[PDB]
């Protein structure tokens, strides 16, 4: 299950114009949000008793300082780049960064940067590198970024050293909460919807996220449309696996496969 728990450090930076800007951030260990970073705060809030991992209060405060410095400079850099290139506002930047630990103490890391919802560049090994699609103005932006030796060192330090060590401690600290199973409640219903009905198979209050819900004719799958797995404020999930059918077909079942049921499935007939 180690692969199902990567650390994703997410940054959203909105620049409406030359004056207005805000940068907010989150941390996800697998499907669990472990941290939050508001623009109105000097520090990075921990949302779980185990969110610090195995890091000491002073080890955590060094990271707080790195992040605060990173934030203010990141805004500075973008405002400067948009001025040098004449990239007119409003600008939105996003960062997906972190790592994933593998067995035998090996890891995999990443640093992806998007501009207006499109990938533009990534950190690769020791330096920034542009995406394959990436416009020509990005190659100039990277040239200036790759000149900064200190930054390339810190991001190598965070991605290669801090991150693998962080998540190993998060996995040991949060072991209990990460292993929880919450069984779903399932029911069928008349989903409102020419000459067609919507069959709705409700699956709710399940944990963790992986679920397989499918409409069946027993031993015969259909053109099942399980929609988004929607979130609940208690970290459980909700799913409406729906089937668009012609009037009658009234000999179809719903098969619900989830980890909390321990190998057995919930079958609902109608």
């Amino acid at each position, epitope marked *: 299950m180690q692969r199902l728990f990567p650390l994703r450090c997410l940054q959203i930076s909105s620049f409406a114009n030359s004056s207005w800007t805000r940068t907010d951030g989150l941390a996800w260990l697998g499907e669990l949000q472990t941290h939050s970073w508001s623009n109105d705060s000097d520090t990075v809030r921990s949302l779980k008793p185990w969110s610090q991992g195995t*890091f*000491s209060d*002073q*080890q*955590w*405060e*060094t*990271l*707080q*300082h*790195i992040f605060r*410095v990173y934030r203010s400079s990141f805004t500075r850099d973008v405002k400067e780049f948009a001025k040098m290139l004449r990239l007119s506002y409003p600008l939105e930047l996003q960062v997906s960064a972190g790592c994933e630990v593998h067995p035998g103490n090996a890891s995999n890391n990443f640093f992806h940067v998007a501009f207006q919802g499109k990938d533009i560049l990534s950190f690769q090994g020791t330096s920034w590198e542009p995406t394959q699609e990436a416009p020509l103005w990005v190659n100039l932006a990277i040239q200036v970024l790759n000149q900064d030796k*200190w930054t390339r*060192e*810190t991001v190598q*330090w*965070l991605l*290669n*050293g*801090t*991150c*693998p*060590q*962080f998540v190993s401690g998060l996995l040991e600290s949060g072991k209990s909460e990460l292993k929880k199973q919450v069984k779903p409640k399932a029911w069928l219903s008349r989903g409102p919807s020419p000459g067609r009905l919507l069959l709705v198979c409700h699956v709710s209050g399940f944990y963790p996220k992986p679920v397989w819900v499918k409409w069946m004719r027993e031993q015969e799958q259909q053109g099942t449309q399980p929609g988004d797995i929607l979130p609940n404020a208690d970290e459980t999930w909700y799913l409406r696996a729906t089937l668009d059918v012609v009037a009658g077909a009234a000999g179809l079942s719903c098969r619900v496969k989830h980890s909390s049921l321990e190998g057995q499935d919930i079958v609902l007939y109608w």
Partner: nanobody, 126 residues
Framework: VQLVESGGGLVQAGGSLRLSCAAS????????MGWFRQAPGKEREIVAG????????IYADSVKGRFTISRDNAKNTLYLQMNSLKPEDTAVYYC????????????????????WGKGTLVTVSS
């Protein structure tokens, strides 16, 4: 961000000298501090490095058991207590700082420290 070293001078062999370093910035306690030295001809090497309270500091084999590094987070100052000095210890002593994240060991090379003072001059005779 800004560091100033003080305590350099002339010391006789077997002597003792206490260098000090003043930091200008905020959250001094989260910065890694280091004492580096450069003798005429020879490259700029490390003498002592220090980071978190729980963490043991690092030393160069030549200055192990003779020199001691310490910090006074409140006084925002870094110290180097040089004891049983040799003429070999004649060098320009620099004060260095850097933000080093938790998963990484205190750096031994000068290329890894970002803030450098203008340095102090220490000379040992006999």
């Amino acid at each position: 961000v800004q560091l100033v070293e003080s305590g350099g001078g002339l010391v006789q062999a077997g002597g003792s000298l206490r260098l000090s370093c003043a930091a200008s910035g905020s959250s001094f306690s989260s910065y890694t501090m280091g004492w580096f030295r450069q003798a005429p001809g020879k490259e700029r090497e490390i003498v002592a490095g220090i980071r978190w309270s729980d963490e043991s500091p690092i030393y160069a084999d030549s200055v192990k058991g003779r020199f001691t590094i310490s910090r006074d987070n409140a006084k925002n100052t870094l110290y180097l207590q040089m004891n049983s000095l040799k003429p070999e210890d004649t060098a320009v002593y620099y004060c260095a700082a850097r933000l080093v994240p938790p998963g990484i060991p205190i750096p031994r090379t000068s290329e890894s420290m970002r803030y450098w003072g203008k340095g102090t001059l220490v000379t040992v005779s006999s």
